[PDB]
Amino acid sequence: LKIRDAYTIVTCPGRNFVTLKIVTESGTHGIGDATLNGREMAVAAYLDEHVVPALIGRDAGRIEDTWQYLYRGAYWRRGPVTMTAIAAVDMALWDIKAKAAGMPLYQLLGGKSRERVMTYAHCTGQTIEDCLGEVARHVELGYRAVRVQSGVPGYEPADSSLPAEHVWSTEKYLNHAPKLFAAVRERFGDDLHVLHDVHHRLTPIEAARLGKAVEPYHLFWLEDCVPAENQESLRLIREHTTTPLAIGEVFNSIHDCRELIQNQWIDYIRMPLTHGGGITAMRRVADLASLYHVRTGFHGPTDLSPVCLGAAIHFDTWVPNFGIQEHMPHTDETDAVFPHDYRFEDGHFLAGESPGHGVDIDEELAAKYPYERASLPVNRLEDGTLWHW
Amino acid sequence: SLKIRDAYTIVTCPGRNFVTLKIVTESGTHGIGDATLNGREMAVAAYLDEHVVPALIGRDAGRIEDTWQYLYRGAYWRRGPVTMTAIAAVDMALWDIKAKAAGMPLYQLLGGKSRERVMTYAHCTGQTIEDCLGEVARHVELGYRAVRVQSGVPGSLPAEHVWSTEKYLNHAPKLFAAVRERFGDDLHVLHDVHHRLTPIEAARLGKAVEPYHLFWLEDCVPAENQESLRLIREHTTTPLAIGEVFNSIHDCRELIQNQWIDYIRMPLTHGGGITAMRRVADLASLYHVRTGFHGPTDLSPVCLGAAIHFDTWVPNFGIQEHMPHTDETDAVFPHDYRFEDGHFLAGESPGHGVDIDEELAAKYPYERASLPVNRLEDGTLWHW
Ligand SMILES: O=C(O)[C@@H](O)[C@@H](O)[C@H](O)[C@H](O)CO
Numbered sequence: 001l002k003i004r005d006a007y008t009i010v011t012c013p014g015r016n017f018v019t020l021k022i023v024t025e026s027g028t029h030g031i032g033d034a035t036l037n038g039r040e041m042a043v044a045a046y047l048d049e050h051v052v053p054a055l056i057g058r059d060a061g062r063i064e065d066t067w068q069y070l071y072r073g074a075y076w077r078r079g080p081v082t083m084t085a086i087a088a089v090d091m092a093l094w095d096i097k098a099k100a101a102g103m104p105l106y107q108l109l110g111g112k113s114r115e116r117v118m119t120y121a122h123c124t125g126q127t128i129e130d131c132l133g134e135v136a137r138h139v140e141l142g143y144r145a146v147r148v149q150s151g152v153p154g155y156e157p158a159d160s161s162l163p164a165e166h167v168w169s170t171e172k173y174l175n176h177a178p179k180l181f182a183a184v185r186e187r188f189g190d191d192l193h194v195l196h197d198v199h200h201r202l203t204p205i206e207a208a209r210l211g212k213a214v215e216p217y218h219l220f221w222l223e224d225c226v227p228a229e230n231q232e233s234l235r236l237i238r239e240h241t242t243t244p245l246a247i248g249e250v251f252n253s254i255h256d257c258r259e260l261i262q263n264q265w266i267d268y269i270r271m272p273l274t275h276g277g278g279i280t281a282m283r284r285v286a287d288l289a290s291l292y293h294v295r296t297g298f299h300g301p302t303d304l305s306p307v308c309l310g311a312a313i314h315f316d317t318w319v320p321n322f323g324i325q326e327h328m329p330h331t332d333e334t335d336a337v338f339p340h341d342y343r344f345e346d347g348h349f350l351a352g353e354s355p356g357h358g359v360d361i362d363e364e365l366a367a368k369y370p371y372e373r374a375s376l377p378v379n380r381l382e383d384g385t386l387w388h389w
Numbered sequence: 390s391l392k393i394r395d396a397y398t399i400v401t402c403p404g405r406n407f408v409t410l411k412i413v414t415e416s417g418t419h420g421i422g423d424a425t426l427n428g429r430e431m432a433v434a435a436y437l438d439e440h441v442v443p444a445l446i447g448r449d450a451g452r453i454e455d456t457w458q459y460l461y462r463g464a465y466w467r468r469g470p471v472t473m474t475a476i477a478a479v480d481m482a483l484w485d486i487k488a489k490a491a492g493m494p495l496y497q498l499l500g501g502k503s504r505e506r507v508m509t510y511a512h513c514t515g516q517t518i519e520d521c522l523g524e525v526a527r528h529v530e531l532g533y534r535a536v537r538v539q540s541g542v543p544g545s546l547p548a549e550h551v552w553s554t555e556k557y558l559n560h561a562p563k564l565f566a567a568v569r570e571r572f573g574d575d576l577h578v579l580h581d582v583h584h585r586l587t588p589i590e591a592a593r594l595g596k597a598v599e600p601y602h603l604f605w606l607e608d609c610v611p612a613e614n615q616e617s618l619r620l621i622r623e624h625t626t627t628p629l630a631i632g633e634v635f636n637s638i639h640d641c642r643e644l645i646q647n648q649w650i651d652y653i654r655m656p657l658t659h660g661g662g663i664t665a666m667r668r669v670a671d672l673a674s675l676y677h678v679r680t681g682f683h684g685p686t687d688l689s690p691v692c693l694g695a696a697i698h699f700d701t702w703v704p705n706f707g708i709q710e711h712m713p714h715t716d717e718t719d720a721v722f723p724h725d726y727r728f729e730d731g732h733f734l735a736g737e738s739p740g741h742g743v744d745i746d747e748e749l750a751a752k753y754p755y756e757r758a759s760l761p762v763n764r765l766e767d768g769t770l771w772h773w
């Protein structure tokens with residue numbers, strides 16, 4: 001499987017996606033997601049200028065050696081641009097390997113551990129009542145799990161060419177959030193899995209406060225409570241609440257969460273394939289997690305392409321310690337650019353049976369949607385302080 | 390303070406690749422920051438060109454702290470080599486501007502001088518021990534009081550080197566033996582392990598070299614897992630340095646707080662700039678850790694000039710690495726720092742004292758070049 005060609009495709013069927021494609025001598029090809037929301041062209045350049053030329057002539061069957069070659073060989077290790085490029089290669093190589101094996105990817109990984117992949121939907125509204133209306137609608141679609149967000153008194157996040165500036169007040173939020181969860185439980189009961197994303201805005205003692213306040217609502221998870229570059233940040237939360245915790249969509253390395261996991265400070269690891277060094281790296285993450293009862297909860301936003309979603313569904317299908325799969329539906333244009341054989345049914349994903357990860361890119365269609373810059377917002381406190389979005 | 394009127398990158402290859410960021414205010418005052426990331430240069434260039442520069446326009450140039458947080462937190466995806474280098478580039482350019490506006494060389498704005506000169510070390514690399522010894526001699530004559538000694542081990546795209554840990558461990562002590570026997574004990578002797586050992590091997594090496602009293606043993610082992618340094622520290626009193634591959638205080642917070650290293654090596658260009666490195670040096674000071682800035686040729690004279698200003702002020706200065714740039718590189722980046730008798734003297738001109746000759750720079754187009762990779766004798770892709 002000597003690599004004849006490799007290149008990136010950049011497209012915007014409703015939002016930006018970057019994709020690496022690798023083509024071997026026998027015409028066997030694989031694609032990997034390389035999308036990094038708000039910083040897309042950095043990964044495209046990292047790939048186009050520095051990785052791509054090095055892939056020509058390599059044996060595409062050597063997945064592990066290529067991963068170490070790119071990770072160690074970069075000299076500068078880890079990081080979002082770095083690991084997303086590496087994940088793109090890794091994802092494409094596993095795609096090729098599965099095709100060469102004549103197997104859908106989940107079979108290659110060790111076979112299926114489950115007959116379907118539970119997901120959760122996004123239920124958002126300006127008021128509690130709107131959110132509740134959303135919960136109803138998604139329950140009717142078959143979803144067993146919902147992420148609930150509402151407005152605090154007093155959707156594509158990367159919504160502006162340059163970062164939009166939002167205002168934040170922690171105390172208003174804390175005083176309001178438990179009210180949402182109580183109303184969700186009042187209307188829908190305890191059968192429903194209910195998730196909330198705190199989205200980095202709290203200090204640990206504040207997140208401890210919240211966690212304790214929402215214990216009577218039995219959240220499936222409380223996600224991204226606090227910025228966690230300092231992993232010890234989760235300690236105070238964990239020591240003060242039994243509300244399950246989730247973190248890691250902003251992580252790109254097992255070194256970002258090793259201590260979180262070993263200390264049992266989280267219940268679910270959120271780092272996905274595209275940002276976490278791909279299949280090769282994520283297997284090691286899931287394995288470590290399994291030693292401590294920690295389960296996978298893959299980030300699955302619009303800003304990871306169907307290539308990642310397809311591969312993630314295969315991964316979800318095999319991995320023993322599967323928790324849940326996030327599902328923010330891509331636009332119809334996006335789905336058309338990325339033909340795939342995974343399917344959604346009654347609140348769950350079903351892995352494809354086609355060899356590879358089951359996803360392709362229609363390059364002719366993708367060319368109809370040129371890149372359009374879009375940045376993630378910033379968050380400021382009411383005094384102007386640049387805060388966490 | 391004034392608004393940023395323009396910002397752009399310059400990419401030049403006067404002997405090797407450099408990427409540079411320039412920021413220009415309403416008044417026409419300008420500043421520059423190094424953004425060079427060896428072997429991945431265009432990732433940072435694109436990071437800057439497409440995502441950061443457009444957001445700089447109209448910003449108040451005097452708001453260094455706010456711009457740093459804005460880019461660090463606002464990126465959402467935090468930390469990393471490309472990320473933090475891009476942030477360093479902005480930070481350095483903004484400090485350059487603020488020092489100009491204050492009419493002071495950078496070291497004054499940071500708190501003034503703590504020392505009269507900045508000690509450096511020279512690279513003395515030889516194919517053999519003898520070769521190495523000759524380099525030490527010739528740098529001693531240039532006035533260097535400290536030398537980094539390396540010898541070969543007997544028996545566009547990335548070069549691929551072969552490596553033998555056991556051969557290196559049996560050989561290295563002989564190098565230091567010979568250096569000490571010829572040059573005596575006054576000289577500071579440094580050695581760079583360059584990532585190739587496991588911790589118990591590095592502990593072995595550390596013990597073996599105790600009799601030769603090295604200034605430091607550097608980058609013993611890959612340290613994404615900061616606990617990797619613990620076994621070394623518990624088995625040897627040979628001083629340890631690490632950090633040129635780091636880009637964040639979170640890459641080294643535990644190494645420092647646990648007193649596992651003596652010198653932190655992360656430089657301005659890759660460690661998020663002046664703003665970030667002040668925080669790292671402050672943490673280091675609490676635990677007797679001193680700065681030992683990475684100073685290869687792949688960090689531009691822009692970085693070196695700013696590092697020298699930093700070195701001049703920082704209380705817990707250790708040493709400054711010096712790999713002299715080529716003549717053409719020096720011409721492309723005019724500067725007022727000077728090397729004398731083994732030490733640097735900071736510039737006295739306002740800003741960090743480095744400029745870029747854009748006309749000259751445009752004469753040297755980018756030329757792709759990659760860092761080598763290492764493989765064991767069995768083919769295993771190892772740490773370079
Ligand atoms: O959990 C989530 O889905 C959110 O945190 C993401 O939609 C996130 O805001 C975007 O992926 C940012 O790129």
Ligand SMILES: O=C(O)[C@@H](O)[C@@H](O)[C@H](O)[C@H](O)CO
Nearest residue numbers: 427581633684685686687760
């Ligand atoms: O200490 C040193 O001088 C070396 O480790 C560096 O030259 C390093 O190998 C390169 O600068 C990385 O680009």
Ligand SMILES: [Cl-]
Nearest residue numbers: 079081469471
């Ligand atoms: Cl990065």
Ligand SMILES: [Mg+2]
Nearest residue numbers: 197223224249
């Ligand atoms: Mg989230």
Ligand SMILES: [Mg+2]
Nearest residue numbers: 581607608633
């Ligand atoms: Mg070094």
